[PDB]
A paper describes a structure:
In the present study, we present the structure of the phosphoprotein oligomerization domain from BoDV-1, revealing a tetrameric assembly in solution and in a crystal structure. We determined the structure of the BoDV-1 phospho­protein using X-ray crystallography. The crystallographic unit cell contains two copies of a P-protein tetramer that are stacked side by side in an antiparallel arrangement. The crystal form contains large gaps between the ordered proteins of 29–45 Å; presumably, this volume partially or fully contains the unresolved N- and/or C-terminal residues. The A–D tetramer is essentially identical to the E–H tetramer (r.m.s.d. of 0.31 Å for equivalent Cα atoms). Many structures of the oligomerization domains of phosphoproteins have been determined either alone by X-ray crystallography or in complex with the viral polymerase by cryoelectron microscopy. The BoDV-1 structure determined here is assembled from approximately straight helices, similar to the Sendai and Nipah paramyxovirus structures although lacking the N-terminal capping helices.
Mononegavirales encode a viral phosphoprotein (P) that binds both the viral polymerase (L) and the viral nucleoprotein (N). The P protein acts as a molecular chaperone and is required for the formation of a functional replication/transcription complex. Phosphoproteins appear to have a globally conserved structure with a central oligomerization domain flanked by largely unstructured N- and C-termini.
Author numbering:
A (entry chain C): 82 to 162
B (entry chain B): 83 to 158
C (entry chain A): 85 to 152
D (entry chain D): 83 to 162
The structure:
């Protein structure tokens, strides 16, 4: 049964080896998908675009202030009629 | 003696349970990872934000038109 | 010595399964928190409602233009 | 007898390699997962979006003021 012990040893090694293979197959599979996850996340970061968008809306507002000034100037003139 | 065979049978069972848990865990985590990337894709609104700005720009151009119109009425 | 060694291997293999379950259980907990956090970054409704307001703004501009 | 001990000794060595690979992978994936959640937090722009909308609403409110002012000139131009 000395050979028996050897076959049982080789079978144990093979299985353990396959286990290590499944563990390595997974960890890199999940890590890769995780790298694609973080990347897709970066895409959803529209911080700069929004801040720019607000500053243009602000220029807009400052242009309506201007329009009002001109508006009330016409008002004065037609009032001094 | 053959107490080794029964011992080997037990070792096979436990190791098989291990492999099952490994495959189950990785299979579950991966399915939730595909759900994560897909949900993130939804959070991308680059097109929407851009159309919004282009609308603000058109609106600004319309402001300039009124401004010219106003001064025009002034000259009158 | 075969059984005592078998008892030793069983302990280590049992510890192995525990670490596997711990790792998988922890990572999933952080992914459910991750997916939930990702869901928060969806602003489709807000972005669109904002645009509809700008459309009213333009509509009012066109109204002013005709008034003049 | 001895050949059994070395066989057992190998199992200890190999299983230790197994535990190490397990710990390395889990530690690595989690660290990259915490990087994921933090990056996701960056993508939340609710506050900015909200202030953005409130400014456009003020913009509309000011337009209504202009409409009222513009009519005033029409009432006075209507004098004639």
């Amino acid at each position: 049964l000395a050979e028996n012990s050897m076959i049982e040893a080789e079978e144990v090694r093979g299985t353990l080896g396959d286990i290590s293979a499944r563990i390595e197959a997974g960890f890199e599979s999940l890590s890769a998908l995780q790298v694609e996850t973080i990347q897709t996340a970066q895409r959803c970061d529209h911080s700069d675009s929004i801040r720019i968008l607000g500053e243009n809306i602000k220029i807009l507002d400052r242009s309506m202030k201007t329009m009002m000034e001109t508006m009330k100037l016409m008002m004065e003139k037609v009032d001094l009629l």
